[PDB]
Amino acid sequence: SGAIYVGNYRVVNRHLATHNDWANLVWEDSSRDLLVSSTTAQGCDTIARCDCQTGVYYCSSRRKHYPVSFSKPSLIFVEASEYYPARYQSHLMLAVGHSEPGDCGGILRCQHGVVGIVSTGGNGLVGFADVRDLLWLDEE
Ligand SMILES: COC[C@H](C)NC(=O)c1nn(C)c2ccccc12
Ligand SMILES: [Zn+2]
């Protein structure tokens, strides 16, 4: 589990969104595994606006933050899960790192801010849904 709280927005993995999230929807994209909802209180996270390929992510299955090198956001084939069939997921970045299904939502961050959240993984790999291209997350 995990969310990014920037301004009046809550960014969660679309497959983990609650009834309250759907009842206060701002934007969702199934192919990116992202959903954004509105919040009443202001968030303290800051979105990275950069082209970084190194950062640090939170792994709840180890209660540790790990330094990682990750690929550029792309269209990657992802195996079937309980939440999606086997399909291509867009805006996905891969890294070598420990992950388990419940690690979804952990933040990946660089020196510029929050880069994205854990979305995919398995066999010593961890994948992150990028949020750096979503410039609207900074205003209104
Ligand atoms: C976009 O896919 C949504 C689903 C719920 N995600 C996964 O299956 C999944 N996510 N992580 C971090 C894993 C690690 C190990 C095995 C599976 C996974
Ligand atoms: Zn950066």
UniProtKB/Swiss-Prot annotation:
Listed as disulfide-bonded, the cysteine pairs are: none
The record's catalysed reaction(s) read: Selective cleavage of Tyr-|-Gly bond in the picornavirus polyprotein
- Residues that bind Zn(2+) 1: 50, 52, 110, 112
Which residue windows are coiled coil? none
Question: Where does the record place the catalytic residues?
Answer: 15, 33, 104
What quaternary arrangement does the UniProt entry report? Homodimer.
Describe its function: Cysteine protease that cleaves viral polyprotein and specific host proteins. It is responsible for the autocatalytic cleavage between the P1 and P2 regions, which is the first cleavage occurring in the polyprotein. Also cleaves the host translation initiation factor EIF4G1, in order to shut down the capped cellular mRNA translation. Inhibits the host nucleus-cytoplasm protein and RNA trafficking by cleaving host members of the nuclear pores. Counteracts stress granule formation probably by antagonizing its assembly or promoting its dissassembly.
Q: Quote the protein name from its UniProt record.
A: Protease 2A
Organism, per UniProt? Coxsackievirus A16 (strain G-10)
Q: Which residues of the full protein are shown?
A: 869 to 1008 of 2193
